[PDB]
Design a binder for this molecule. Structure first.
Ligand SMILES: Nc1ncnc2c1ncn2[C@@H]1O[C@H](COP(=O)(O)OP(=O)(O)OP(O)(O)=S)[C@@H](O)[C@H]1O
Ligand SMILES: [Mg+2]
Lengths: 441, 258, 258, 267
């Protein structure tokens, strides 16, 4: 009846697939909070989680952040007072609302009372990187609370390295959540399936995760599509329903790359059963991923379409070039909300053409696009190198920094005696080091 | 001739004053309706103030309500509606079986004017609390108009207001940055006007501090009863109560840290 | 000599008048004649048009030999009009082909002369069009009794439907939070003729309007103590506000409803 | 516990002034509350003397509460009490109708006490306000003779100012041929209110007294005048004096003393 992500939502931190390291880091902080307070938050314990009034969770969509924060709170007996983007968190309302609970106790904490925190709040300011123009000065006031609160404060966001999030930098314990581990999600998904009365090839359960880029919430929803679609599952159906489901609802981006890369469609015969018009049309079946898909695996095929006496390499270079050209086209299509009339050309230059040059037998296997997550790595690191520059600009363009900050690595990693010497003799602090350490790594 | 609940407020203005009494700190609230009357509790958005209502069958010129029904409704919407009714009007609550809405009939003596409004109910998953009559260290009472002035005055000085009951004496203090605010009132009873008398049944001293914002919100019940009951205890939320000819509107305010 | 000599019995008159335009209408060219003043204008949406007619009967003296064209801004004019005490008398004064109109306030005991200048607004437009002169239904009620029903329902919808059925004036509004319906009948209180409600019907009427405008309309409730309303399917509704020697009338277009 | 007795009454004090009526002071401060922000209230054995010049530095307020405004007054040594009117306003809003207001300060003030006493002693309220340290400005007792001197009801004067202030940001005042004129040339139009010296006998309250010596014509900032009229909350009629070189003087008489603004013309 209820969505699956709901009915199968963790009930104990003992069910959060992944980030277990960060969950611990979280739970701890929420434990030593009373003491951290007792000590005026000036004793950064062996964890550092001691000089921070509030914690800042962050990471990709559907990986357990909101589940952890809530759960870690309910586990230490505290009562929860949460807000999110659906609420108005402007500086005005913020100061006329929650500001008042920063040093207050739960009225529910009484009619519930052995609980040691039952009468205390854990403020969960969720979806903070979602505070728009409907929250004037919200981040500022919120970042000010991280310094003057008298109760645990937990903030969640997806992009910690954003400009809007700058005011939060030095003010709180930011624990990172990365994309859960496949085995974790694979194991979890299995458990689900079993309880849902069905089985699935570990190769299917595997590529899903790969498509979902780790979004455990998405896979769960995506996995509830089978039983919800068909009326009655049977002994045999299980093995075949995967097809219609996988090649349609689930891994559709794959059945596209498959068809597109099948040489049988480019041979004189099939060449007219599945016309040029159809090949181009396959593109409009997911014009979002199709270009990414072809580029991803146009070089992992055993071509059957090569002209007589044409090497696999040569034909690839031709598609390589076309892939390149199609890009030029895309950029322009995305430079003017009014250029969609160029998509057909892009269909040809980014998929159909490159494909026809190497279509045939599938040597390896259709892989999801590497470009997306690969675009996260590069981006998430430019932000780092950036803040590092806006700290060394005192001592070359941000570019000349990553192409000259090589020597620095030595006199900052070399042996790790002369510790303090170089470190401080650089005008760097704690975060100035922890940050420069990440990228350099 | 088609309902499971049909109450008829003696005075329309009543139900309004009753709801304007707490529609600023609570948004969604479940109204439990049964034989004897209407009961409803709701926690604050900041989870600091608990609000409890109780409307006895003696406030309606006629009160039906066959089976027990839950009326989860948004006070802002309901408030817009009640705002409609005029003076000479007999507000009648009407609810069918397993309602999706609720009707509010504003009739008039002169049967030449009838105005009925429908109000879509809300689905509220109320965290029902177990309120239990406790033995508070101190129990005072005074004119609501006075408690109001005191609270409004002091709130201009601090975000916190300390209420001290020492040696049978009521003392409110507010210490801010611009300065401090102190008010003290001694019990008495004026036979001339019993309603302006300050009571006080102390059994043990009490020193609690409340958020000024929540008191400014509680004093809004100062339109239901000319007097306000306050029960304080070092280990429990304060209790501010307003008396209604057939019930009451009470507030449970959790204190601040020591 | 003044080609336009207009003295209002009471400066407090021309004040209640312009309050009708002020909000819904932007600029209004005032055309004067030998029998009084007339003016019209329309919403930038072309949904509502206002028609003003001021007769000399509401003047302590009128002399506009040759007709004039006084274009002016209500926000600017409404200001000049507030600078009048309840003991003064207003006097419109314009020369041959006005380049700005003059308002004169004066007392009757102490020498106090308040003369304000006011540039004139020329928009190069003077389209005065009226065509309806016979509606399927005519009703009347107190301007205050109306403005109420209006703002009440405005809370639940962007549209209000004035449904005229067999001797029953019905106002309805259906929206997101709920519905609202006010049904008042034609009644007369021998002791209070003003609060009486008259309604003469011929053919049923059913037409919805946009509360937006309907609201700006009930502001003319300042011009009188009773509003007249004439309806006719697929035809702009006419809301008229009676005045001793003239009137302020609003022509509001409905909405195609099928 | 047992020290729950206010301090104000029992402390060693150099200043202890009880008002005739709380509201009086409440009203006073309001008359100049909007112009100034921080003022130094110099208390002497004779009464209270306060002055202040707006940030723009073109308006000057001068208060003076004579010892006659007090039920009992005993300041026995010159003390300067700087304080923010915004805070003062708040304290002053806590006073009831049947409540007496006593200003108290100790021989070494770091703040000021405002004690509210009631008929039924059952209600005592003590507010303390932290003093501010302002650079006190010496009295500008300059009484340059003004070319013209007039007075009219404060209620009727306020409107004039407020009404014309709609037309322009600069109100003009002329005293030509023993006749008072208020001009306002704005963007949309013009305004002109003229009042001659009128003297009623049945209602002497409402009268316009004038004294012409030299033709007058001055222009001040309306924004300012809008605040100046606030004194309308203390005196029934306000007296104005205008000079060709000296700023404008608007006075609101009070039994004990008076509130007076010294606005400098805009050139
Ligand atoms: N790490 C995880 N372990 C187990 N189940 C998970 C995990 N992450 C997500 N889920 C499921 O996904 C649903 C939503 O997860 P949330 O923790 O609310 O996501 P989130 O990381 O806050 O995502 P946002 O709001 O898009 S940032 C839950 O109710 C779970 O069923
Ligand atoms: Mg979330």
């Amino acid at each position: 009846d209820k969505l699956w992500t709901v009915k199968y939502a963790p009930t104990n931190l003992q069910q959060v697939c992944g980030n277990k390291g960060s969950v611990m880091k979280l739970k701890n902080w929420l434990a030593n909070w009373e003491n951290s307070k007792k000590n005026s938050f000036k004793h950064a314990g062996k964890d550092g989680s001691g000089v921070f009034r509030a914690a800042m969770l962050y990471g990709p969509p559907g990986i357990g952040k909101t589940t952890a924060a809530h759960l870690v709170a309910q586990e230490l007996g505290y009562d929860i007072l949460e807000q999110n983007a659906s609420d108005v968190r402007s500086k005005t309302l913020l100061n006329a609302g929650v500001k008042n609970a920063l040093d207050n106790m739960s009225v529910v904490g009484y009619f519930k009372h052995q609980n040691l925190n039952g009468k205390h709040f854990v403020i969960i300011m969720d979806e903070v990187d979602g505070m728009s123009g409907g929250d004037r000065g919200g981040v500022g006031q919120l970042a000010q609370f991280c310094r003057k609160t008298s109760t645990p404060l937990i903030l969640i966001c997806n992009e910690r390295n954003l400009p809007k999030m700058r005011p939060f930098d030095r003010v709180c314990l930011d624990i990172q959540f990365r994309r859960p581990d496949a085995n974790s999600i694979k194991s979890r998904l299995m458990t689900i399936a079993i309880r849902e009365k069905f089985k699935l090839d570990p190769n299917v359960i595997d590529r899903l995760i790969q498509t979902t880029r780790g979004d455990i919430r998405q896979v769960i929803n995506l996995l509830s599509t089978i039983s919800t679609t068909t009326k009655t599952i049977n002994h045999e159906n299980i093995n075949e329903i995967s097809k219609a489901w996988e090649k349609n609802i689930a891994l559709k981006p794959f059945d596209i790359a498959h068809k597109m890369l099948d040489g049988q469609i480019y041979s004189d015969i099939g060449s007219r059963n599945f016309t040029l018009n159809d090949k181009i049309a396959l593109y409009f079946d997911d014009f979002d991923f199709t270009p990414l898909m072809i580029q991803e695996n146009y070089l992992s095929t055993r071509p059957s379409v090569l002209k007589p006496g044409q090497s696999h390499l040569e034909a690839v270079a031709e598609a390589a070039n076309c892939i390149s050209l199609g890009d030029i086209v895309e950029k322009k299509i995305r430079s003017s909300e009014q250029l969609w009339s160029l998509l057909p050309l892009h269909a040809v230059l980014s998929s159909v053409y490159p494909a026809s040059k190497v279509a045939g037998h599938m040597a390896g296997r259709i892989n999801f696009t590497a470009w997306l997550g690969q675009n996260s790595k590069s981006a998430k690191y430019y932000r780092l190198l950036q803040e590092i520059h806006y700290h060394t600009r005192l001592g070359x363009x941000x570019x000349x920094x990553x192409x000259x900050x090589x020597x620095x690595x030595x006199x900052x990693x070399x042996x790790x005696x002369x510790x303090x010497x170089x470190x401080x003799x650089x005008x760097x602090x704690x975060x100035x080091x922890x940050x420069x350490x990440x990228x350099x790594x | 001739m088609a309902s499971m609940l049909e109450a008829k407020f003696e005075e329309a203005s009543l139900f309004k004053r009753i709801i304007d009494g707490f529609k600023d700190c609570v948004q969604l609230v479940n109204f439990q309706c049964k034989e004897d009357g209407i009961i409803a509790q709701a926690v604050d958005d900041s989870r600091v103030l608990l609000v409890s209502l109780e409307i006895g069958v003696e406030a309606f010129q006629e009160y039906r309500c066959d089976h027990p029904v839950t009326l989860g409704m948004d006070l802002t919407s309901l408030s817009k509606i009640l705002r409609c009714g005029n003076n000479t009007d007999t507000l009648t609550l009407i609810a069918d079986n397993t309602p999706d809405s609720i009707i509010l009939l504003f009739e008039d003596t002169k049967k030449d004017r009838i105005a009925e409004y429908s109000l879509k109910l809300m689905d509220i998953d109320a965290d029902f609390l177990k309120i239990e009559e406790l033995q508070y260290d101190s129990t005072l009472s005074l004119p609501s108009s006075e408690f109001s002035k005191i609270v409004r005055d002091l709130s201009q000085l601090s975000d916190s207001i300390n209420i001290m009951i020492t040696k049978e004496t009521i003392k409110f203090v507010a210490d801010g940055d611009i300065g401090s605010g102190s008010v003290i009132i001694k019990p008495f009873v004026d036979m001339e006007h019993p309603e302006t008398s300050i009571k006080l049944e102390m059994d043990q001293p009490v020193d609690l501090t409340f958020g000024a914002k929540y008191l400014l919100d509680i004093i809004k019940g100062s339109s239901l009863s000319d007097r306000v009951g306050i029960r304080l205890s070092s280990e429990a939320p304060a209790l501010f109560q307003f008396d209604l000819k057939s019930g009451f509107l009470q507030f449970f305010l959790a204190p601040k840290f020591n």
